[PDB]
């Protein structure tokens, strides 16, 4: 709703008086089904999803991470609508300091480069952004904030239901004599993630 609709069914969004969503960030225990969501989204939606593992963006050439980000939003800015999907932001995710190595300064800027684009003056249009992380405890205050990230999307460890629900999905392609102990497996299976 936040992401797909505000594109093919935003023409009436203004009829409520609300700009399309801004950004969405998964954030959950390692294995809650985050990385599998970006895949499912770009597979179904299909439009212009550009995935950035937020790691291979870093180089070493002064502002080599500023140009990558500029081109990312530029390409997209022109090419929009486009989905921006960043895998693990904890990299550029950062948090700032006071301070750290002369290296950290590079990331920050770079960490800021995006922040200034997501908001700043020129107003993102059509092009939307999915933020990815495991552990959101690390992120900069100035990033989580609306105008940058709209609403955070939590993905908790599947319930006994969610387990069972997911359990019959991965074990569905297995040769199993009329003895499938789904209610037993799921039961003992607690705190167990999706993988």
């Amino acid at each position: 709703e936040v992401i797909e609709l505000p594109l093919t069914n935003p023409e009436l969004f203004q009829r409520v008086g609300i700009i399309p969503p801004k950004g969405c960030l998964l954030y959950g225990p390692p294995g809650t089904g985050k990385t599998l969501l970006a895949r499912a989204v770009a597979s179904q939606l299909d439009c212009n999803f550009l995935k950035v593992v937020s790691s291979s963006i870093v180089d070493k050439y002064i502002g080599e991470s500023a140009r990558l980000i500029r081109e990312m939003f530029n390409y997209a800015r022109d090419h929009q609508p486009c989905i921006i999907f960043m895998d693990e932001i904890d990299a550029i995710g950062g948090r700032r300091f006071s301070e750290g190595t002369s290296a950290d300064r590079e990331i920050q800027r770079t960490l800021m480069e995006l922040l200034n684009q997501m908001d700043g003056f020129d107003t993102l249009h059509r092009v939307k952004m999915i933020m990815a992380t495991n552990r959101p405890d690390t992120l900069d205050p100035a990033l989580l904030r609306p105008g940058r990230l709209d609403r955070k999307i939590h993905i908790d460890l599947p319930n006994e239901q969610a387990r069972l629900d997911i359990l019959k999905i991965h074990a569905g392609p297995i040769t199993k004599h009329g003895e499938i102990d789904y209610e037993a497996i799921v039961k003992l299976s607690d705190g167990f993630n999706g993988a």
């Binding site: 319930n159 006994e160 239901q161 039961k187 003992l188 607690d190 705190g191």
Partner: protein, 244 residues
């Protein structure tokens, strides 16, 4: 400040430079380690307790897994947190009630039981040799004049009366739900209370329970003896929820 530490203020129960007690906070964290959630709702003429009954294995006598305890024939409690600590605190509560009746010649009020237990845990908070208990007790019972009562005590020494409360993993969410559903002002009958509590837990966990996945304690004005509902009557309450 804002997270500052000095000396042993994160190991024993002494003051941090910003005036915190870190071991107590850690005890609160220890409550959630059980991975359970309990809901307590006070009615016009009753009090209801409800709790997940996680019996992960059929190799366990499912009758011996209970977080509901009889403190007195007319005072019930539900424990949330570290199991063995919970039982310790239950024994202490039992003793304090019995002793109260023996010295004062009337039945202990939940208010004073909770206050007593709390008072005991504050000592753990203030003495260095021992560590707080990683548990949380919620007491219910009918007082002679104040009507139905639900109280709750913490690992630090805090205790309070409630219209409705919860403890454990989904505490904040259950409080949000309940504080939404209390403002609506409805005739809090018995079934209204039971349904409210059960649905609070159910929606908070998104489960829709079997009658063997939860346990429901109760106390009424018409029947003040703390009664633990059989699986049958629980189910009777369950099927009535898939009607409206």
């Amino acid at each position: 400040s804002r997270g500052s530490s000095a000396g042993f203020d994160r190991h024993i129960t002494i003051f941090s430079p910003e005036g915190r007690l870190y071991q107590v906070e850690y005890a609160f964290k220890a409550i959630n380690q059980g991975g359970l959630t309990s809901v307590a709702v006070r009615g016009k003429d009753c009090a209801v307790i409800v709790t997940q009954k996680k019996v992960p294995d059929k190799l366990l006598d499912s009758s011996t897994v209970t977080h509901l305890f009889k403190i007195t024939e007319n005072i019930g409690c539900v424990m949330t947190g570290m199991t063995a600590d919970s039982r310790s605190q239950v024994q202490r509560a039992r003793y304090e009630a019995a002793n109260w009746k023996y010295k004062y010649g009337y039945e202990i009020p939940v208010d004073m039981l909770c206050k007593r237990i709390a008072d005991i845990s504050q000592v753990y908070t203030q003495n260095a040799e021992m560590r707080p208990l990683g548990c949380c007790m919620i007491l219910i019972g009918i007082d002679e004049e104040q009507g139905p009562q639900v109280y709750k005590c913490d690992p630090a020494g805090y205790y309070c009366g409630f219209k409705a409360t919860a403890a454990g993993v989904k505490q904040t969410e259950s409080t949000s739900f309940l504080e939404k559903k209390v403002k609506k002002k409805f005739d809090w009958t018995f079934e209204q209370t039971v349904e409210t509590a059960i649905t609070c837990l159910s929606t908070v966990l998104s489960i829709d329970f079997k009658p063997s996945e939860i346990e429901v304690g109760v106390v009424t004005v018409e029947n003040p003896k703390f009664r633990i509902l059989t699986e049958a009557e629980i189910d009777a309450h369950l099927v009535a929820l898939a009607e409206r």
